[PDB]
């Protein structure tokens, strides 16, 4: 069932380091902000004309070191960048200048999260801590509880929780081999998740916000319930799964293995498609793996940022 084929449609050249992270806003479907190892963000405008799927719009210089995680705002006009210089930068997606410079992490920041609304900034850093900031730039909360580095923090979207609660729930993980849930208003702990043999490389809550997918070094992908606080399922990728991403339309998990990109069909608990682009002049032992994954707003296109300094887009083209 669902004989869905996805084919590479364009390549977004222009970066100069590994495209570490990607982000897309639901409101604005034709804009894509990508941060790379070249210490710069790039805003891409997507064109449905010919070979190139997008067009770079603005490069955001101002970061001294590696840019790890990139998050766009809900409205699609602001972008928060986490870099390896222990600082966070807020950028106006049109002006190109920085608005706020969040400072306070003693270790280089690895991930950043946007609030459901435009209120709070959640940042994870190597200093074993999480920081909650306002949009102005000051740090409101210093959440502890992790004894090692925290690599990924992405907010669980509130779908239909009771009506309304004014409570902000997200997850956090890193080299502590644990996954933690946090609730904000106040701004304290929630349930835990201990399933990983090795340390967690990346976590990503489902678009609805009730499934949390975590991945690690051993390629052991775990899927948990947050609102139920229980395990949902478990698979093995048998490679290095660098990044993973849910899909808005389909019930799918893209996983960036060290060898290629797997897609897991969640309802059938079986992988369906594998993505391995064709490079040239290599030795098949160091083919550029994927480090960043991001689906489109609808769930029609997939953006993958590789170590070959390239964004490649796979458009879903169901060949019957």
């Amino acid at each position: 069932s669902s004989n869905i084929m996805l084919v590479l449609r364009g390549t977004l050249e222009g970066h100069n380091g590994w495209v570490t992270s990607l982000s897309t806003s639901a409101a604005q479907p034709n804009l894509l902000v990508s941060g790379s190892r070249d210490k710069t963000l790039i805003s891409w405008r997507l064109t449905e004309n010919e070979q190139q799927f997008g067009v770079p719009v603005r490069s955001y210089k101002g970061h001294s070191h590696i840019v790890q995680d990139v998050v766009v705002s809900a409205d699609g006009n602001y972008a928060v960048s986490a870099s390896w210089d222990k600082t966070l930068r807020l950028w106006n997606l049109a002006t190109g200048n920085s608005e706020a410079r969040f400072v306070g992490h003693t270790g280089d920041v690895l991930s950043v999260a946007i609030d459901a609304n435009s209120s709070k900034i959640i940042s994870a850093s190597r200093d074993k801590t999480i920081r909650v900031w306002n949009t102005v730039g000051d740090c409101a909360y210093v959440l502890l509880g992790h004894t090692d580095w925290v690599t990924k923090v992405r907010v669980a979207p509130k779908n239909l929780e009771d009506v309304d609660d004014g409570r902000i729930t997200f997850v956090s993980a890193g080299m502590d081999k644990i996954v933690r849930s946090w609730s904000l208003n106040s701004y304290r702990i929630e349930a835990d998740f201990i399933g990983h043999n090795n340390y967690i490389n990346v976590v990503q809550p489902s678009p609805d916000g009730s499934l949390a997918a975590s991945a690690g070094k051993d390629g052991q992908i775990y899927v948990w319930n947050l609102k139920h606080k229980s395990a949902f399922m478990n698979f093995d990728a048998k490679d290095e799964v660098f990044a993973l991403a849910f899909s808005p339309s389909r019930f799918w998990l893209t996983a960036a293995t060290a060898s290629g990109i797997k897609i897991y069909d969640l309802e059938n608990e079986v992988l369906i498609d594998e993505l391995k682009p064709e490079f040239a002049g290599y030795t098949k032992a160091q083919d550029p793996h994927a480090v960043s994954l991001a689906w489109s707003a609808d769930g029609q296109t997939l953006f993958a940022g590789y170590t070959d300094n390239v964004i490649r887009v796979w458009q879903v083209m169901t060949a019957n």
Binding site: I42, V55, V57, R58, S59, K61
Partner: protein
């Protein structure tokens, strides 16, 4: 000196154009300018790294030496 100043103005004008286009114009224009520039006298956007070598005793030059008598 004179020619050093001239090359400084060259670099200043080129880098100013590129930075302005990056800041307020567009990415494609900036990359086109960089392709036009760096394909011609790479120093136009990249500062030269060669600079004078400190002098040393026993030599009237930075790397030269005095004459030897030998007899």
């Amino acid at each position: 000196g004179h020619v050093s100043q001239v090359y400084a103005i060259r670099q200043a004008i080129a880098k100013g154009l590129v930075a302005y286009h990056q800041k307020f114009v567009d990415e494609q224009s900036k990359n086109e300018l960089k392709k036009a520039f760096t394909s011609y006298d790479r120093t136009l956007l990249i500062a030269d790294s060669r600079r004078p070598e400190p002098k040393k005793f026993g030599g009237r030059g930075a790397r030269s030496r005095f004459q030897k008598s030998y007899r």
